[PDB]
């Protein structure tokens, strides 16, 4: 159970990187909305950033956290340098996807999947 670390030696060090990444993303949204001429608001973009971070709040492995931060930095680089096009940024929002029903009855009516 002794392993080679990526960047962080423990969760406290790992969570510092997470906070630093969040600040970078938070400040980048207004530029992204303007640069990509998005029809979403700056608040929506920041609400989406928070949602992406929040879904990984249960991780307790510092190596997994490091990879998530590493991948998050790559995604931020693709956005700042405008390697992404508008389609790539807007894929986070699933605009053309119909609302998937959640409750048991709705899923029962449409098909067999749980």
């Amino acid at each position: 159970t002794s392993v080679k670390p990526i960047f962080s030696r423990d969760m406290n060090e790992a969570k510092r990187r997470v906070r630093e990444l969040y600040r970078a993303w938070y400040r980048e949204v207004p530029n992204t909305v303007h640069l990509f001429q998005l029809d979403i608001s700056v608040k929506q973009g920041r609400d989406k950033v928070r949602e992406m971070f929040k879904k990984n709040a249960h991780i307790t492995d510092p190596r997994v956290v490091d990879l998530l931060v590493i991948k998050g930095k790559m995604e931020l680089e693709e956005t700042i340098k405008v390697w992404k096009q508008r389609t790539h940024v807007m894929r986070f929002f699933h605009e053309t996807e119909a609302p998937r029903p959640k409750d048991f009855l709705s899923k029962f009516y449409v098909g067999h999947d749980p």
Partner: protein, 125 residues
């Protein structure tokens, strides 16, 4: 310099799989049954992991079998059930494990075909 990690290995967040195809799937870990049409046993050596079968429907244009299940063809191979279970656990799939069925040792005797007083005597060869 190494560090100490006690968390159960969980990589679900860094594999890119959509959440639906982790939580709602049931992996089946098993050794495939011998195809009864043949006597060869070489296809029963390894452990397999497959996922639950989902809807296939008829394509309106051609009648071809359409699917919306991205794991419909995924079948993984493992040396042992422990390797298969470990792979399933770290990927967040719930699983069922079926113990390997091995044909039991049989007692064969060509001479029994001609028994003097037992029912094993054969009427034809």
């Amino acid at each position: 310099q190494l560090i100490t990690v006690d968390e159960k290995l969980d990589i679900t967040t860094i594999t890119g799989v959509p959440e639906e195809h982790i939580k709602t799937r049931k992996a089946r870990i098993f050794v495939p049954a011998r195809n009864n049409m043949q006597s060869g046993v070489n296809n029963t050596k390894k452990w397999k992991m497959e996922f639950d079968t989902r809807e296939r429907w008829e394509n309106p244009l051609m009648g071809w079998a359409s699917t919306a299940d991205p794991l419909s063809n995924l079948v993984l191979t493992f040396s042992t059930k422990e390797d298969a279970v470990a792979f399933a656990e770290k990927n967040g799939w719930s699983y069922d494990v079926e113990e390997r069925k091995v044909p039991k040792p049989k007692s064969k005797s060509y001479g029994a075909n001609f028994s003097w007083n037992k029912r094993t005597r054969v009427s034809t060869k």
